[PDB]
Amino acid sequence: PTQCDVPPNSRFDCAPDKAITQEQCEARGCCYIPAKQMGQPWCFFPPSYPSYKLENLSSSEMGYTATLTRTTPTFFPKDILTLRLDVMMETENRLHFTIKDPANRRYEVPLETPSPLYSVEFSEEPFGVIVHRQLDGRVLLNTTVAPLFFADQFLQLSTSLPSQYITGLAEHLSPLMLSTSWTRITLWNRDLAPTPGANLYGSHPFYLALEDGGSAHGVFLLNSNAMDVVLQPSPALSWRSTGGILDVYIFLGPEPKSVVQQYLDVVGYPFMPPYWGLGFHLCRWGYSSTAITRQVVENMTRAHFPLDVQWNDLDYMDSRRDFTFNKDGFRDFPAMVQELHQGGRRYMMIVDPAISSSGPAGSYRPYDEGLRRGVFITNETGQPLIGKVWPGSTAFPDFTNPTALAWWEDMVAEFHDQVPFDGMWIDMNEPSNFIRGSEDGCPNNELENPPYVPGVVGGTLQAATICASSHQFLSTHYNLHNLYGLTEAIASHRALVKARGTRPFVISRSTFAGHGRYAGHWTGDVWSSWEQLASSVPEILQFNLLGVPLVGADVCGFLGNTSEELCVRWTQLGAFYPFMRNHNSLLSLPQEPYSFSEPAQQAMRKALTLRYALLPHLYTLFHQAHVAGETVARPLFLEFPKDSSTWTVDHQLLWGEALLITPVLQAGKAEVTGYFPLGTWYDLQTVPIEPREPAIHSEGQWVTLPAPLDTINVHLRAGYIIPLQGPGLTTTESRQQPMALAVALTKGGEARGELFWDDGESLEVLERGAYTQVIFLARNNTIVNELVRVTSEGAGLQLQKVTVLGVATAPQQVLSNGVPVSNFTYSPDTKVLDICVSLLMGEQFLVSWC
């Protein structure tokens, strides 16, 4: 047929709900053409398939409103035949539209609200929204490409994509750039060890699409229901959600970093972590007493390994229950944590969401009080839904209930009164259930058995979690499931603020869009494998683009047994995770830095030492994330979008604009090949911290670098200045040391950098102005600071070393504030000028040479 002449790559599936025969396909009013070898749909929509018609388009002060009408039913039940379209032109960068049922309030995700670069026009029949980039006329969105479906439990909205390059749609084990070859991406939070093609712990319905020439846009669908996102190679995308409404934001960039910042303007800028949170964290399942746990710190200390935060897993609890500690191995738990604090370290422990429900009445306050106050998710007969997790039978708190929030704050404060822990590791908050749904199964209804089930592991919404039709304060679990973790992270953030009075530190397994405003994330139960080491790079980068910059993987891997070589390379790379924790499973061989051979220990110690030297810089990068929606770890394409060679690179990463990390990610290698964008890149090993080229002069090219077992390649971009600080086994110690600058000159002698400094943990620092901020500038053989703000926290900072890279000629003299310096060295082979000074970050200085 004429209408069935649709190019293969542009066929949209008219049988996404079930296996179909040719006769049934045709009776739907669809085209049946088998592919010649999910894949390309054999049953697909002709361009005439019934959609909605636009009627009564009107122009308001905020934008546009219209009615959308479907005349012919779809093959799903409960089509909503009359919809309302609202288009809001919110800023020059942000376009917002919604499609709703004007006759019924439908579930919506709870969220605080925050010439243009876009234009918008509409197709009448079939209905579509078309968004152009005004500067070049590129079509960014065109929803005319397939029918709009809007049924009670099935929404589908499709669009063309501007290129084959698209990233986002966490959480999945994938390259940073997603495959457009008939790929079904499922968002349904699920406790499963990361494996390819699976819905994992978190769900972020946001994508960033690259455009030829290096501009980009982003799209956020504000919808928390179970969904599939289907990418096809035309290229095009289909959102398929199981409930809610279509609430769509388009972010115009044009730069990828701006797209990310614009997205974070809606969902929230990243929270500012405490400085100590950027130190090394060490944990395992199996530190089964305070004595053993104390030995970890002792063993790290004796072998000169920095450690800011000691953790415990389930070991601490009384019979694996929250807000208890056993009176055998952990009898003296309070004293252990007090002692940690006396030495300048912090303490973290695991908290699960589910609460043991099986104890005698009156014997377990978290449950007894939860029951009294009605804090738990309830079932059909109004009683707590009971599942099974680590303690046995458990009820599940409803973190959408304000009373549950108050209860959680209370349980956290009461436990903190016994043991003064410094944050919360919130696990199992998908929510995870070791049985299907509940001890009593689940009822048979349309929420438990919906007409479209996304491609979830196990083929049901109840698999490894609770019943979809269970009740929460705001809605059913069906609607709220993908928010469970997020809502717990918000509750825990608030609880920690109230209990401790300083910045919270929450690390969560499950996440949703906006998570980064409250908490960080670790990537869960990764294997100790070379595969998963390599896969951690794109995953950490992905979460940075999603505004969760406090992210990392379990260093050396969680599951199975690490090898020495793997743990060296994983420690080297993982020292560049913004959140750095080595964590290990119960039955695995030990993998603490001190448990390896001497050469391995040296390499691991070096990795940790370099991280601690860089902490002032890392902290400043977090400040930029927090105040301007920047990324901390970023892919090369975020920083060099106009170099199309960067677009598929995800085994290198940047810290901010200027530090390029090129890890070895394979066994047996003593070299690595990395992409170097146009520029001069100085080898960071030429900066004295306490055939290798000193500078890579790149045109935009791949470069093979020596990378023996003791080495990770780290390069500093010309034009940038990096603040550093002296060593310590903790940040309590390190923050008191002298600082240094590493100054990477351009060929013309230019560089710029910055330092942000506050007390490291107080609330409302920016609001109160309790911070110091300094800019550094190199120009014409001088280095100066520029004092943006100087306060008490910052006025003691001693600058004792200035290292200048790319100094072509040996200076005859070096001056600090007009006075010849006590000592400097120049190396003619590396072009490094190293200068001892006695200066203050917060007082104006001028260092010069000639």
Ligand X SMILES: OC[C@H]1O[C@H](O)[C@H](O)[C@@H](O)[C@@H]1O
Ligand Y SMILES: OC[C@H]1O[C@@H](O)[C@H](O)[C@@H](O)[C@@H]1O
Ligand Z SMILES: *[C@@H]1O[C@H](CO)[C@@H](O[C@@H]2O[C@H](CO)[C@@H](O[C@@H]3O[C@H](CO)[C@@H](O)[C@H](O)[C@@H]3O)[C@H](O)[C@H]2NC(C)=O)[C@H](O)[C@H]1NC(C)=O
Ligand U SMILES: *[C@@H]1O[C@H](CO)[C@@H](O[C@@H]2O[C@H](CO)[C@@H](O)[C@H](O)[C@H]2NC(C)=O)[C@H](O)[C@H]1NC(C)=O
Ligand V SMILES: *[C@@H]1O[C@H](CO[C@H]2O[C@H](C)[C@H](O)[C@H](O)[C@H]2O)[C@@H](O)[C@H](O)[C@H]1NC(C)=O
Ligand W SMILES: *[C@@H]1O[C@H](CO[C@H]2O[C@H](C)[C@H](O)[C@H](O)[C@H]2O)[C@@H](O[C@@H]2O[C@H](CO)[C@@H](O)[C@H](O)[C@H]2NC(C)=O)[C@H](O)[C@H]1NC(C)=O
Binding site for ligand Z (CB under 6 A): 379-381, 383-386, 440
Residue of the chain from 48, 56, 195, 418 that contacts ligand W (CB under 6 A)? 56
**Could you tell me the smallest distance in angstroms from the CB atom of residue 592 to ligand U?**
6
The site partner of 69 among ligand X, ligand Y, ligand W, none (C-beta below 5 to 8 Å per kind) is ligand W
> CA 564 to CA 604: how far, in whole Å?
10
> Per rule CB under 6 A, is residue 27 in the interface with ligand V?
no
> Per rule CB under 6 A, is residue 15 in the interface with ligand Y?
yes
Sign for the pseudo-dihedral over CA of 678, 683, 686, 690: positive
> Per rule CB under 6 A, is residue 67 in the interface with ligand W?
yes
Is residue 578 a contact partner of residue 551, using CB atoms and an 8 Å limit? yes
* Interacting residue ranges for ligand U, rule: CB under 6 A: 47, 123, 126, 130, 139, 142, 144-145, 292, 295-296, 299, 592
> Per rule CB under 6 A, is residue 313 in the interface with ligand X?
yes
Residues 6+ apart with CB under 8 A from 382: none
The site partner of 314 among ligand W, ligand X, ligand Y, none (C-beta below 5 to 8 Å per kind) is ligand X
The site partner of 144 among ligand Y, ligand X, ligand U, none (C-beta below 5 to 8 Å per kind) is ligand U
Backbone angles phi, psi at 64, to 5 degrees: -125, 150
Question: Which among 199, 240, 125 is positioned nearest to 461, based on CA atoms?
Answer: 199
How many chain residues touch ligand Y (CB under 6 A)? Answer: 5
Answer yes or no: is 715 a known binding residue: no
Answer yes or no: is 651 a known binding residue: no
The site partner of 346 among ligand U, ligand Z, ligand X, none (C-beta below 5 to 8 Å per kind) is none
Span near ligand Y by CB under 6 A; candidates 12-20, 375-383, 392-400, 825-833: 12-20
Between 25 and 187, name the residue whose CB sits nearer to ligand Y: 25
Between 232 and 591, name the residue whose CB sits nearer to ligand V: 591
Half-sphere exposure of 788 (CA within 13 A, CB side): 14
> Per rule CB under 6 A, is residue 819 in the interface with ligand Y?
no
Kindly write out the interface string for residues 498-527 of this chain, putting x where it contacts ligand X by CB under 6 A and - elsewhere.
-----------x--------------xx--
Between 344 and 560, name the residue whose CB sits nearer to ligand V: 560
Between 262 and 324, name the residue whose CB sits nearer to ligand X: 324
> CA 149 to CA 31: how far, in whole Å?
18
Stated as kind and residue range, the H or E segment containing 761 is: none
Answer yes or no: is 494 a known binding residue: no
Between 322 and 639, name the residue whose CB sits nearer to ligand X: 322
Q: Which two tokens stand for residue 641?
A: 């979008």
Question: How many residues in the chain?
Answer: 850
The DSSP string of 234-302 is: TTEEEEEESSS-EEEEEE--SSHHHHHHHHHHHH-PPP---GGGGS-EE--TT--SHHHHHHHHHHHHH
> Per rule CB under 6 A, is residue 314 in the interface with ligand X?
yes
Residue of the chain from 561, 698, 762, 800 that contacts ligand V (CB under 6 A)? 561
> CA 467 to CA 461: how far, in whole Å?
8
Three-state DSSP string of 767-832 = HHCCCEEEEEEEECCEEEEEEEECCCCCCCCEEEEEEEECCCCCCCCEEECCEECCEEEEECCCCE
Is residue 519 a contact partner of residue 493, using CB atoms and an 8 Å limit? yes
Residue of the chain from 116, 233, 560, 694 that contacts ligand V (CB under 6 A)? 560
Answer yes or no: is 650 a known binding residue: no
> Per rule CB under 6 A, is residue 69 in the interface with ligand W?
yes
> Per rule CB under 6 A, is residue 589 in the interface with ligand V?
yes
Catalytic residues: 427, 430
> CA 191 to CA 464: how far, in whole Å?
7
**Could you tell me the smallest distance in angstroms from the CB atom of residue 50 to ligand W?**
15
DSSP class of residue 143 equals G
Between 17 and 369, name the residue whose CB sits nearer to ligand Y: 17
> Per rule CB under 6 A, is residue 86 in the interface with ligand W?
no
> Per rule CB under 6 A, is residue 586 in the interface with ligand V?
no
Residues 6+ apart with CB under 8 A from 360: none
Q: Which two tokens stand for residue 683?
A: 């080898």
Kindly write out the interface string for residues 371-410 of this chain, putting x where it contacts ligand X by CB under 6 A and - elsewhere.
----------------------------------------
**How many Cβ atoms are within 10 Å of 646's Cβ, its own excluded?**
20
Residue of the chain from 27, 39, 179, 850 that contacts ligand X (CB under 6 A)? 39
Three-state DSSP string of 154-222 = EEEEEEECCCCCEEECCCCCCCCCCCCCCEEEEECCCCCCCCCCCCCCCECCEEEEECCCCCEEEEEEC
Q: Collapsing DSSP states into helix, strand and coil, what is residue 486?
A: helix
DSSP class of residue 508 equals E
Q: Which two tokens stand for residue 554?
A: 């379990």
**How many Cβ atoms are within 10 Å of 23's Cβ, its own excluded?**
9
The site partner of 145 among ligand V, ligand U, ligand Y, none (C-beta below 5 to 8 Å per kind) is ligand U
> Per rule CB under 6 A, is residue 20 in the interface with ligand Y?
yes
> Per rule CB under 6 A, is residue 65 in the interface with ligand V?
no
> Per rule CB under 6 A, is residue 452 in the interface with ligand Y?
no
> Per rule CB under 6 A, is residue 19 in the interface with ligand Y?
yes
Q: What is the contact surface with ligand W in residues (CB under 6 A)?
A: 55-56, 67, 69
Q: Binding site residues for substrate, as ranges?
A: 313, 509, 525, 583
Q: Which residues bind ligand V (CB under 6 A)?
A: 560-561, 588-589
Q: Which residues are annotated as a binding site?
A: 313, 509, 525, 583
